[PDB]
RNA sequence: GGAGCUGUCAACCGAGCGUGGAUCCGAGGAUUUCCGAAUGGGGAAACCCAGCACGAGUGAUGUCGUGCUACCCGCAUCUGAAUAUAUAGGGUGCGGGAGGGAACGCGGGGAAGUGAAACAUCUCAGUACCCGUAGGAGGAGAAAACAAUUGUGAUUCCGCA
RNA sequence: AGGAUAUGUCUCAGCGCUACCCGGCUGAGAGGCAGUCAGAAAGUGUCGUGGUUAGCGGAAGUGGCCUGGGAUGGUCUGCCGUAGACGGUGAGAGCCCGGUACGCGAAAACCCGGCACCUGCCUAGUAUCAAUUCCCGAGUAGCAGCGGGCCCGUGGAAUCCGCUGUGAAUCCGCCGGGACCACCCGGUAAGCCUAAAUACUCCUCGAUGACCGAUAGCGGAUUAGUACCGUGAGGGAAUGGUGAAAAGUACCCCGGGAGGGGAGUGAAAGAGUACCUGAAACCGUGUGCCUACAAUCCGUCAGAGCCUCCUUUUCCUCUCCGGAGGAGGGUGGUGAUGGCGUGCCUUUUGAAGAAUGAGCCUGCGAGUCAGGGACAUGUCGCAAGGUUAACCCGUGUGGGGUA
RNA sequence: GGGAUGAGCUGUGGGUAGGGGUGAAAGGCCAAUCAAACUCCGUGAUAGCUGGUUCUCCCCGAAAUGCAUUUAGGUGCAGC
RNA sequence: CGCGGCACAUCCACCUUGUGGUGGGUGUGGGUAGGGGAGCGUCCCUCAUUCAGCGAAGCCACCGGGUGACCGGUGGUGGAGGGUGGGGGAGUGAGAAUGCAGGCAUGAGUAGCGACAAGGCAAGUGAGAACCUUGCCCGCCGAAAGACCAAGGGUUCCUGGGCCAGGCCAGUCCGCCCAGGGUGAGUCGGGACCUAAGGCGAGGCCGACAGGCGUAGUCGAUGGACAACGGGUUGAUAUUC
RNA sequence: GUUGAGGCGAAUUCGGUGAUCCUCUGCUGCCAAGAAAAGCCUCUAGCGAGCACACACACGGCCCGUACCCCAAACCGACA
């Protein structure tokens, strides 16, 4: 996916819309990501958060506003690189 | 190709790998037990027992590893039984076949039920089935042909008639 | 084929008994042609705007408000579009995601094509005349017998195929034109090869559906040719759905457990792994009415009495009440009692019948399709004309197409 | 109750296959079915016979006779 | 006959004076096989329009409606698709086929609980004991109901757990369920030795094809040949240790 | 003696009866006249310069089965 483990994201749909966090685990096969502070659930002992669908997040470009992800033609060294749209640089 | 991964039922774990590029996708190669046309011999398929050669191992028999060893046909060579010419046959070396596959092709063998308001000619039907044998298709195909007073000009397939 | 006039792709070495003309043959070199082909068979390099086998990029809303667990819904708005295909995402998404239009991409391998190497063929015969001779596919053709097959069932039965017998000729030959004969016309059997137009899909990609949606659709959405049955060849099932997310009920109580209650999660437990919705048969519990002196196809018409819920009167007038209660009127439930009344289907002259069939519920289960078929009709277009079939061209349902 | 040293009983291995086998003979037996086994295929065999054939209302409304028939419980034509 | 509603036909006049409507007379309206005419309901497609997480479908109840098939409104349940109109197409309607599949009744808490050897008490275990464990009595078999094999079966054997399925009752037990363990051969039974009946069968002979038979040979025990006895030991093997 | 394992451990003589077993693949009788091959011994063909034997020591002895039921609740009968 375009959302990686260390990325910081913003929630664009669901109960926790508008919250900010960073990914903790990516599940490319199921198209889910685990983000702290989002849909924390009260499991029974003897509270943690559950993964949300990757469609519900935007990767924050680390420059403020959320954005969609594109790629620039690198390599030139030595492979492809992930950058942003909406004034993209990465 | 680019950040996760160690397939699934099917989770639980355990232990690890990955930007020095994993997992994953494509291509080529290596490995590939035993049975099976099964083909060293045998056999109740997946088991048993060998021969030869070269290696390994043992104090030496035992034991292990790798190759080759069916039958038939064709070709090439050596030999020429009863028997003389010779042939049958035999030895050696090269090639080849065998079996499988859903349908379609070609050649050959070929029912009955049913219909005939009974039934044998007839039909069903050259169908079902069987045998042989292919190819990506096959079969046919280049006039010992049609036509009829004019002419057409190898074959195949479609529509008419 | 063989004879007489009639000549040397280009050259060279040899040879054809010797000196000569004309040669001819072999080998080599020189040129032209063809080539993976039916007409000859392989291989070797190199090059592809070539193709196949992985793939990559790819525009545009974190918009406001309302409802909601959740917006992809409604309403205001902003934008992209060579992209408004499809699918997912917590409910109907072109702008959230995979993607789509469109455009890039191949080490290597394979397929295809090109160019060379390579292979092989061509190395004088052209015409004229002669009409004397030779050749033109043999146990074949023809003929006879018995059969098969042709529209043709043996018929006057040609043409084609098989077995048996007999058995020709080489152009003045032989065969065919539906018995046969004469003439005429056509053709040249008994040797071989040959692309395309045609048939099919185990399989691999990409699409589609006025097709099915879990008793359907494949036997097979589930362990499926499995379980199971048969000695065997064979036969051959049944079983899908929590929730958006396991957040799958911590803890306490009764209980050996099973199970439950309280808490808790969840929008919902009126989703608790026996789980979406949750019908009927069938089985309970509570309750209103009726029923133990009566002979009942079980209903129907007449009909008292109870029970219940609403209203019009006169009464509690406490009345803002509300209505107890009284009467009346009407709903609905039940039905003491009176009359009438022989279940359904099929098959029959005729059945309540002691003729057939049915224990009950739910689901499934029978006049369909094809054809320029045949007859008759309704309707529509054109009209002394109407209409195309195959086929061709188009993204289609459109345009051509006169047989 | 019969035989129980015999034309005996029995174990193991083998052979005969469907118009065929085998039968001291009953049409007996051939995998609980035999006057021609079983399985798959022709095949959705055929049946003048039996059964079944699903929503509604409006108008009209029969026949069980004649002739023929390998015909009589079928069908063709007539009649209605 | 009286009064009211419906329908078909015909007649009489109007409206487009027959595509059909308006009003009024008269006749007619039982019905099997069968013929004609017109409709209801379910599903799918197309065009237009409209409703829907502020709750579609489906189901259930109530209140109403139409000449019939049937329809509408309201509420409840439920959680994603419907309504109407002009057309098009059907796997379009079941109560019967000793129909098929699933579920469930009646018989009914009924018959039966599988030999005529026979059980009892004490103690124990446990939530639970006629059936399980221990002890002691009693009874039965003893040419088997004892002890070994072969064929067949396949883990049923041992130990430790289990108790909702199974055992014709219950079960703490089990040939049931779960995990782990367990089978030791120069001499035993077989092969590596041998052959019978019979099978296959190089060449071969026969047969249109398919194939039939058969020589050399090679398989094939139920038979021939061939070397072990006694004792001990494990929870489970023993002529094997 | 945790009733598992432990430790010790006597006498063992002479008769009777008596086989479906052994001598006996023998013996007798009978007619219905009663497998094969390997194995073993022997003959030579043949091979043959090294042999055959005794003792002692040290070694090699392969593959499959082996649990359990087995007139049964474990096999064939759909069933304990
Ligand atoms: Mg790989
Ligand atoms: Mg072999
Ligand atoms: Mg063999
Ligand atoms: Mg000679
Ligand atoms: Mg083949
Ligand atoms: Mg016939
Ligand atoms: Mg007939
Ligand atoms: Mg008939
Ligand atoms: Mg081929
Ligand atoms: Mg060909
Ligand atoms: Mg991409
Ligand atoms: Mg809200
Ligand atoms: Mg959606
Ligand atoms: Mg879409
Ligand atoms: Mg989303
Ligand atoms: Mg010729
Ligand atoms: Mg002839
Ligand atoms: Mg004929
Ligand atoms: Mg003829
Ligand atoms: Mg002849
Ligand atoms: Mg003629
Ligand atoms: Mg040819
Ligand atoms: Mg062709
Ligand atoms: Mg099915
Ligand atoms: Mg369903
Ligand atoms: Mg079986
Ligand atoms: Mg809650
Ligand atoms: Mg709900
Ligand atoms: Mg629910
Ligand atoms: Mg249920
Ligand atoms: Mg439910
Ligand atoms: Mg009374
Ligand atoms: Mg009476
Ligand atoms: Mg009454
Ligand atoms: Mg009466
Ligand atoms: Mg009668
Ligand atoms: Mg009756
Ligand atoms: Mg009765
Ligand atoms: Mg009667
Ligand atoms: Mg009858
Ligand atoms: Mg009767
Ligand atoms: Mg009955
Ligand atoms: Mg039609
Ligand atoms: Mg017409
Ligand atoms: Mg006697
Ligand atoms: Mg006796
Ligand atoms: Mg046998
Ligand atoms: Mg038969
Ligand atoms: Mg008799
Ligand atoms: Mg029998
Ligand atoms: Mg017969
Ligand atoms: Mg047929
Ligand atoms: Mg009438
Ligand atoms: Mg009347
Ligand atoms: Mg009527
Ligand atoms: Mg009728
Ligand atoms: Mg809601
Ligand atoms: Mg629907
Ligand atoms: Mg509703
Ligand atoms: Mg509807
Ligand atoms: Mg419509
Ligand atoms: Mg139907
Ligand atoms: Mg029904
Ligand atoms: Mg029924
Ligand atoms: Mg009774
Ligand atoms: Mg009783
Ligand atoms: Mg008993
Ligand atoms: Mg007690
Ligand atoms: Mg046991
Ligand atoms: Mg129990
Ligand atoms: Mg019990
Ligand atoms: Mg043979
Ligand atoms: Mg042979
Ligand atoms: Mg033999
Ligand atoms: Mg043997
Ligand atoms: Mg034996
Ligand atoms: Mg034991
Ligand atoms: Mg043992
Ligand atoms: Mg044992
Ligand atoms: Mg045994
Ligand atoms: Mg049994």
PDB file of N, CA and C (backbone and C1' of nucleotides) in Angstrom, chain C residues 205-233:
ATOM      1  P     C C 205      -5.672 -18.499 -17.418  1.00  0.00           P
ATOM      2  O5'   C C 205      -5.062 -17.280 -18.230  1.00  0.00           O
ATOM      3  C5'   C C 205      -5.647 -16.001 -18.129  1.00  0.00           C
ATOM      4  C4'   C C 205      -5.446 -15.190 -19.379  1.00  0.00           C
ATOM      5  C3'   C C 205      -6.472 -14.101 -19.588  1.00  0.00           C
ATOM      6  O3'   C C 205      -6.208 -12.954 -18.808  1.00  0.00           O
ATOM      7  C1'   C C 205      -6.188 -15.292 -21.598  1.00  0.00           C
ATOM      8  P     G C 206      -7.295 -12.461 -17.738  1.00  0.00           P
ATOM      9  O5'   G C 206      -8.235 -11.523 -18.604  1.00  0.00           O
ATOM     10  C5'   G C 206      -7.671 -10.683 -19.596  1.00  0.00           C
ATOM     11  C4'   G C 206      -8.696 -10.254 -20.608  1.00  0.00           C
ATOM     12  C3'   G C 206     -10.089 -10.001 -20.074  1.00  0.00           C
ATOM     13  O3'   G C 206     -10.201  -8.761 -19.405  1.00  0.00           O
ATOM     14  C1'   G C 206     -10.216 -11.212 -22.098  1.00  0.00           C
ATOM     15  P     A C 207     -11.497  -8.451 -18.517  1.00  0.00           P
ATOM     16  O5'   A C 207     -12.588  -8.041 -19.596  1.00  0.00           O
ATOM     17  C5'   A C 207     -13.955  -8.339 -19.390  1.00  0.00           C
ATOM     18  C4'   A C 207     -14.698  -8.440 -20.695  1.00  0.00           C
ATOM     19  C3'   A C 207     -16.185  -8.706 -20.571  1.00  0.00           C
ATOM     20  O3'   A C 207     -16.922  -7.528 -20.313  1.00  0.00           O
ATOM     21  C1'   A C 207     -15.263 -10.195 -22.138  1.00  0.00           C
ATOM     22  P     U C 208     -17.929  -7.476 -19.069  1.00  0.00           P
ATOM     23  O5'   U C 208     -19.281  -8.063 -19.666  1.00  0.00           O
ATOM     24  C5'   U C 208     -19.775  -7.595 -20.908  1.00  0.00           C
ATOM     25  C4'   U C 208     -20.692  -8.597 -21.554  1.00  0.00           C
ATOM     26  C3'   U C 208     -21.858  -9.077 -20.716  1.00  0.00           C
ATOM     27  O3'   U C 208     -22.921  -8.145 -20.696  1.00  0.00           O
ATOM     28  C1'   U C 208     -20.858 -10.903 -21.843  1.00  0.00           C
ATOM     29  P     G C 209     -23.890  -8.052 -19.424  1.00  0.00           P
ATOM     30  O5'   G C 209     -25.118  -8.973 -19.822  1.00  0.00           O
ATOM     31  C5'   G C 209     -25.555  -9.065 -21.170  1.00  0.00           C
ATOM     32  C4'   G C 209     -26.302 -10.347 -21.418  1.00  0.00           C
ATOM     33  C3'   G C 209     -27.451 -10.606 -20.453  1.00  0.00           C
ATOM     34  O3'   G C 209     -28.510 -11.269 -21.138  1.00  0.00           O
ATOM     35  C1'   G C 209     -25.887 -12.373 -20.309  1.00  0.00           C
ATOM     36  P     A C 210     -29.715 -10.421 -21.773  1.00  0.00           P
ATOM     37  O5'   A C 210     -30.997 -10.900 -20.969  1.00  0.00           O
ATOM     38  C5'   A C 210     -31.177 -10.575 -19.601  1.00  0.00           C
ATOM     39  C4'   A C 210     -32.641 -10.469 -19.271  1.00  0.00           C
ATOM     40  C3'   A C 210     -33.540 -11.458 -19.991  1.00  0.00           C
ATOM     41  O3'   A C 210     -33.606 -12.711 -19.330  1.00  0.00           O
ATOM     42  C1'   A C 210     -34.440  -9.278 -20.175  1.00  0.00           C
ATOM     43  P     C C 211     -33.079 -14.051 -20.037  1.00  0.00           P
ATOM     44  O5'   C C 211     -31.606 -14.240 -19.468  1.00  0.00           O
ATOM     45  C5'   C C 211     -31.366 -14.396 -18.076  1.00  0.00           C
ATOM     46  C4'   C C 211     -31.044 -15.826 -17.732  1.00  0.00           C
ATOM     47  C3'   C C 211     -30.970 -16.167 -16.258  1.00  0.00           C
ATOM     48  O3'   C C 211     -32.234 -16.296 -15.638  1.00  0.00           O
ATOM     49  C1'   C C 211     -29.144 -17.144 -17.364  1.00  0.00           C
ATOM     50  P     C C 212     -32.381 -16.052 -14.060  1.00  0.00           P
ATOM     51  O5'   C C 212     -31.627 -17.287 -13.411  1.00  0.00           O
ATOM     52  C5'   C C 212     -32.152 -18.598 -13.500  1.00  0.00           C
ATOM     53  C4'   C C 212     -31.479 -19.511 -12.515  1.00  0.00           C
ATOM     54  C3'   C C 212     -31.405 -18.999 -11.091  1.00  0.00           C
ATOM     55  O3'   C C 212     -32.602 -19.227 -10.377  1.00  0.00           O
ATOM     56  C1'   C C 212     -29.309 -19.878 -11.735  1.00  0.00           C
ATOM     57  P     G C 213     -33.130 -18.156  -9.315  1.00  0.00           P
ATOM     58  O5'   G C 213     -32.083 -18.246  -8.131  1.00  0.00           O
ATOM     59  C5'   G C 213     -31.791 -19.489  -7.513  1.00  0.00           C
ATOM     60  C4'   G C 213     -30.630 -19.374  -6.566  1.00  0.00           C
ATOM     61  C3'   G C 213     -30.814 -18.351  -5.451  1.00  0.00           C
ATOM     62  O3'   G C 213     -30.326 -18.874  -4.226  1.00  0.00           O
ATOM     63  C1'   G C 213     -28.831 -17.882  -6.655  1.00  0.00           C
ATOM     64  P     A C 214     -31.365 -19.436  -3.149  1.00  0.00           P
ATOM     65  O5'   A C 214     -30.775 -20.851  -2.755  1.00  0.00           O
ATOM     66  C5'   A C 214     -30.771 -21.926  -3.681  1.00  0.00           C
ATOM     67  C4'   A C 214     -30.023 -23.112  -3.137  1.00  0.00           C
ATOM     68  C3'   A C 214     -30.281 -23.413  -1.666  1.00  0.00           C
ATOM     69  O3'   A C 214     -30.216 -24.819  -1.462  1.00  0.00           O
ATOM     70  C1'   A C 214     -27.988 -23.007  -1.989  1.00  0.00           C
ATOM     71  P     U C 215     -31.534 -25.624  -1.046  1.00  0.00           P
ATOM     72  O5'   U C 215     -32.028 -26.284  -2.402  1.00  0.00           O
ATOM     73  C5'   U C 215     -31.331 -27.380  -2.978  1.00  0.00           C
ATOM     74  C4'   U C 215     -32.277 -28.379  -3.595  1.00  0.00           C
ATOM     75  C3'   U C 215     -33.174 -27.835  -4.699  1.00  0.00           C
ATOM     76  O3'   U C 215     -33.420 -28.868  -5.647  1.00  0.00           O
ATOM     77  C1'   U C 215     -34.509 -28.666  -2.951  1.00  0.00           C
ATOM     78  P     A C 216     -32.666 -28.866  -7.057  1.00  0.00           P
ATOM     79  O5'   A C 216     -32.605 -27.333  -7.452  1.00  0.00           O
ATOM     80  C5'   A C 216     -33.698 -26.692  -8.080  1.00  0.00           C
ATOM     81  C4'   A C 216     -33.289 -25.350  -8.616  1.00  0.00           C
ATOM     82  C3'   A C 216     -32.163 -25.367  -9.630  1.00  0.00           C
ATOM     83  O3'   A C 216     -32.628 -25.636 -10.938  1.00  0.00           O
ATOM     84  C1'   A C 216     -31.734 -23.722  -7.991  1.00  0.00           C
ATOM     85  P     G C 217     -31.693 -26.378 -12.004  1.00  0.00           P
ATOM     86  O5'   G C 217     -30.347 -25.545 -11.965  1.00  0.00           O
ATOM     87  C5'   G C 217     -30.222 -24.318 -12.663  1.00  0.00           C
ATOM     88  C4'   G C 217     -28.815 -23.799 -12.575  1.00  0.00           C
ATOM     89  C3'   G C 217     -27.729 -24.804 -12.883  1.00  0.00           C
ATOM     90  O3'   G C 217     -27.547 -25.043 -14.258  1.00  0.00           O
ATOM     91  C1'   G C 217     -27.175 -23.674 -10.914  1.00  0.00           C
ATOM     92  P     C C 218     -27.369 -26.551 -14.748  1.00  0.00           P
ATOM     93  O5'   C C 218     -25.974 -26.981 -14.121  1.00  0.00           O
ATOM     94  C5'   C C 218     -25.873 -28.054 -13.198  1.00  0.00           C
ATOM     95  C4'   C C 218     -24.552 -28.762 -13.353  1.00  0.00           C
ATOM     96  C3'   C C 218     -24.357 -30.046 -12.573  1.00  0.00           C
ATOM     97  O3'   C C 218     -24.966 -31.151 -13.213  1.00  0.00           O
ATOM     98  C1'   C C 218     -22.385 -28.710 -12.513  1.00  0.00           C
ATOM     99  P     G C 219     -26.159 -31.956 -12.515  1.00  0.00           P
ATOM    100  O5'   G C 219     -25.448 -32.795 -11.372  1.00  0.00           O
ATOM    101  C5'   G C 219     -26.203 -33.546 -10.435  1.00  0.00           C
ATOM    102  C4'   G C 219     -25.341 -34.001  -9.290  1.00  0.00           C
ATOM    103  C3'   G C 219     -24.473 -32.929  -8.658  1.00  0.00           C
ATOM    104  O3'   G C 219     -25.183 -32.198  -7.677  1.00  0.00           O
ATOM    105  C1'   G C 219     -23.190 -34.881  -9.054  1.00  0.00           C
ATOM    106  P     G C 220     -24.988 -30.620  -7.535  1.00  0.00           P
ATOM    107  O5'   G C 220     -23.530 -30.467  -6.930  1.00  0.00           O
ATOM    108  C5'   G C 220     -23.260 -30.795  -5.577  1.00  0.00           C
ATOM    109  C4'   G C 220     -21.780 -30.808  -5.311  1.00  0.00           C
ATOM    110  C3'   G C 220     -21.049 -29.519  -5.629  1.00  0.00           C
ATOM    111  O3'   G C 220     -21.094 -28.611  -4.547  1.00  0.00           O
ATOM    112  C1'   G C 220     -19.895 -31.348  -6.582  1.00  0.00           C
ATOM    113  P     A C 221     -21.861 -27.217  -4.679  1.00  0.00           P
ATOM    114  O5'   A C 221     -20.975 -26.214  -3.828  1.00  0.00           O
ATOM    115  C5'   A C 221     -19.560 -26.199  -3.961  1.00  0.00           C
ATOM    116  C4'   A C 221     -18.980 -24.862  -3.590  1.00  0.00           C
ATOM    117  C3'   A C 221     -19.066 -24.500  -2.117  1.00  0.00           C
ATOM    118  O3'   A C 221     -17.996 -23.613  -1.800  1.00  0.00           O
ATOM    119  C1'   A C 221     -20.310 -22.953  -3.362  1.00  0.00           C
ATOM    120  P     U C 222     -16.579 -24.172  -1.301  1.00  0.00           P
ATOM    121  O5'   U C 222     -16.859 -24.652   0.184  1.00  0.00           O
ATOM    122  C5'   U C 222     -16.681 -26.019   0.516  1.00  0.00           C
ATOM    123  C4'   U C 222     -17.223 -26.356   1.878  1.00  0.00           C
ATOM    124  C3'   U C 222     -17.116 -27.832   2.247  1.00  0.00           C
ATOM    125  O3'   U C 222     -16.830 -27.963   3.635  1.00  0.00           O
ATOM    126  C1'   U C 222     -19.380 -27.167   2.301  1.00  0.00           C
ATOM    127  P     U C 223     -15.317 -28.231   4.101  1.00  0.00           P
ATOM    128  O5'   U C 223     -14.871 -29.485   3.226  1.00  0.00           O
ATOM    129  C5'   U C 223     -13.525 -29.638   2.800  1.00  0.00           C
ATOM    130  C4'   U C 223     -13.202 -31.078   2.495  1.00  0.00           C
ATOM    131  C3'   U C 223     -13.977 -31.709   1.351  1.00  0.00           C
ATOM    132  O3'   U C 223     -13.428 -31.397   0.086  1.00  0.00           O
ATOM    133  C1'   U C 223     -13.978 -33.168   3.213  1.00  0.00           C
ATOM    134  P     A C 224     -14.389 -31.131  -1.168  1.00  0.00           P
ATOM    135  O5'   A C 224     -14.988 -32.563  -1.500  1.00  0.00           O
ATOM    136  C5'   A C 224     -14.136 -33.639  -1.857  1.00  0.00           C
ATOM    137  C4'   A C 224     -14.674 -34.403  -3.035  1.00  0.00           C
ATOM    138  C3'   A C 224     -14.765 -33.623  -4.342  1.00  0.00           C
ATOM    139  O3'   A C 224     -14.534 -34.521  -5.417  1.00  0.00           O
ATOM    140  C1'   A C 224     -16.886 -34.437  -3.776  1.00  0.00           C
ATOM    141  P     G C 225     -13.438 -34.198  -6.537  1.00  0.00           P
ATOM    142  O5'   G C 225     -13.811 -35.200  -7.713  1.00  0.00           O
ATOM    143  C5'   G C 225     -13.498 -36.584  -7.622  1.00  0.00           C
ATOM    144  C4'   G C 225     -14.521 -37.341  -6.816  1.00  0.00           C
ATOM    145  C3'   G C 225     -14.325 -38.856  -6.761  1.00  0.00           C
ATOM    146  O3'   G C 225     -14.788 -39.319  -5.496  1.00  0.00           O
ATOM    147  C1'   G C 225     -16.442 -38.388  -7.615  1.00  0.00           C
ATOM    148  P     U C 226     -14.296 -40.719  -4.893  1.00  0.00           P
ATOM    149  O5'   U C 226     -14.169 -40.423  -3.341  1.00  0.00           O
ATOM    150  C5'   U C 226     -13.190 -39.522  -2.856  1.00  0.00           C
ATOM    151  C4'   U C 226     -13.695 -38.769  -1.659  1.00  0.00           C
ATOM    152  C3'   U C 226     -14.552 -39.569  -0.698  1.00  0.00           C
ATOM    153  O3'   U C 226     -13.775 -40.327   0.211  1.00  0.00           O
ATOM    154  C1'   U C 226     -15.598 -37.501  -1.161  1.00  0.00           C
ATOM    155  P     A C 227     -14.137 -41.856   0.535  1.00  0.00           P
ATOM    156  O5'   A C 227     -15.345 -41.760   1.565  1.00  0.00           O
ATOM    157  C5'   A C 227     -15.187 -41.116   2.818  1.00  0.00           C
ATOM    158  C4'   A C 227     -16.516 -40.836   3.470  1.00  0.00           C
ATOM    159  C3'   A C 227     -17.442 -42.026   3.633  1.00  0.00           C
ATOM    160  O3'   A C 227     -17.124 -42.807   4.768  1.00  0.00           O
ATOM    161  C1'   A C 227     -18.652 -40.194   2.767  1.00  0.00           C
ATOM    162  P     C C 228     -17.007 -44.401   4.654  1.00  0.00           P
ATOM    163  O5'   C C 228     -18.440 -44.861   4.153  1.00  0.00           O
ATOM    164  C5'   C C 228     -19.594 -44.659   4.953  1.00  0.00           C
ATOM    165  C4'   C C 228     -20.848 -44.833   4.141  1.00  0.00           C
ATOM    166  C3'   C C 228     -20.973 -46.146   3.399  1.00  0.00           C
ATOM    167  O3'   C C 228     -21.419 -47.203   4.222  1.00  0.00           O
ATOM    168  C1'   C C 228     -21.499 -44.379   1.939  1.00  0.00           C
ATOM    169  P     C C 229     -20.990 -48.711   3.895  1.00  0.00           P
ATOM    170  O5'   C C 229     -21.809 -49.062   2.584  1.00  0.00           O
ATOM    171  C5'   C C 229     -23.225 -49.092   2.602  1.00  0.00           C
ATOM    172  C4'   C C 229     -23.776 -49.447   1.249  1.00  0.00           C
ATOM    173  C3'   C C 229     -23.150 -50.647   0.575  1.00  0.00           C
ATOM    174  O3'   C C 229     -23.604 -51.884   1.088  1.00  0.00           O
ATOM    175  C1'   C C 229     -23.361 -48.898  -0.985  1.00  0.00           C
ATOM    176  P     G C 230     -22.580 -53.105   1.235  1.00  0.00           P
ATOM    177  O5'   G C 230     -22.265 -53.520  -0.261  1.00  0.00           O
ATOM    178  C5'   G C 230     -23.279 -54.065  -1.080  1.00  0.00           C
ATOM    179  C4'   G C 230     -22.792 -54.292  -2.482  1.00  0.00           C
ATOM    180  C3'   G C 230     -21.488 -55.043  -2.639  1.00  0.00           C
ATOM    181  O3'   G C 230     -21.605 -56.435  -2.411  1.00  0.00           O
ATOM    182  C1'   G C 230     -21.532 -53.212  -4.121  1.00  0.00           C
ATOM    183  P     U C 231     -20.544 -57.187  -1.473  1.00  0.00           P
ATOM    184  O5'   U C 231     -19.214 -57.213  -2.337  1.00  0.00           O
ATOM    185  C5'   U C 231     -17.946 -57.410  -1.735  1.00  0.00           C
ATOM    186  C4'   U C 231     -16.944 -57.877  -2.753  1.00  0.00           C
ATOM    187  C3'   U C 231     -16.755 -56.956  -3.943  1.00  0.00           C
ATOM    188  O3'   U C 231     -15.776 -55.972  -3.692  1.00  0.00           O
ATOM    189  C1'   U C 231     -17.075 -59.177  -4.684  1.00  0.00           C
ATOM    190  P     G C 232     -15.968 -54.483  -4.230  1.00  0.00           P
ATOM    191  O5'   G C 232     -15.879 -54.620  -5.809  1.00  0.00           O
ATOM    192  C5'   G C 232     -14.698 -55.071  -6.449  1.00  0.00           C
ATOM    193  C4'   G C 232     -14.974 -55.421  -7.884  1.00  0.00           C
ATOM    194  C3'   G C 232     -15.608 -54.316  -8.700  1.00  0.00           C
ATOM    195  O3'   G C 232     -14.627 -53.460  -9.242  1.00  0.00           O
ATOM    196  C1'   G C 232     -16.816 -56.324  -9.009  1.00  0.00           C
ATOM    197  P     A C 233     -14.919 -51.904  -9.434  1.00  0.00           P
ATOM    198  O5'   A C 233     -15.494 -51.822 -10.907  1.00  0.00           O
ATOM    199  C5'   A C 233     -14.832 -52.469 -11.980  1.00  0.00           C
ATOM    200  C4'   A C 233     -15.751 -52.659 -13.151  1.00  0.00           C
ATOM    201  C3'   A C 233     -16.663 -51.489 -13.449  1.00  0.00           C
ATOM    202  O3'   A C 233     -16.007 -50.489 -14.202  1.00  0.00           O
ATOM    203  C1'   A C 233     -17.914 -53.490 -13.465  1.00  0.00           C
TER     204        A C 233
END
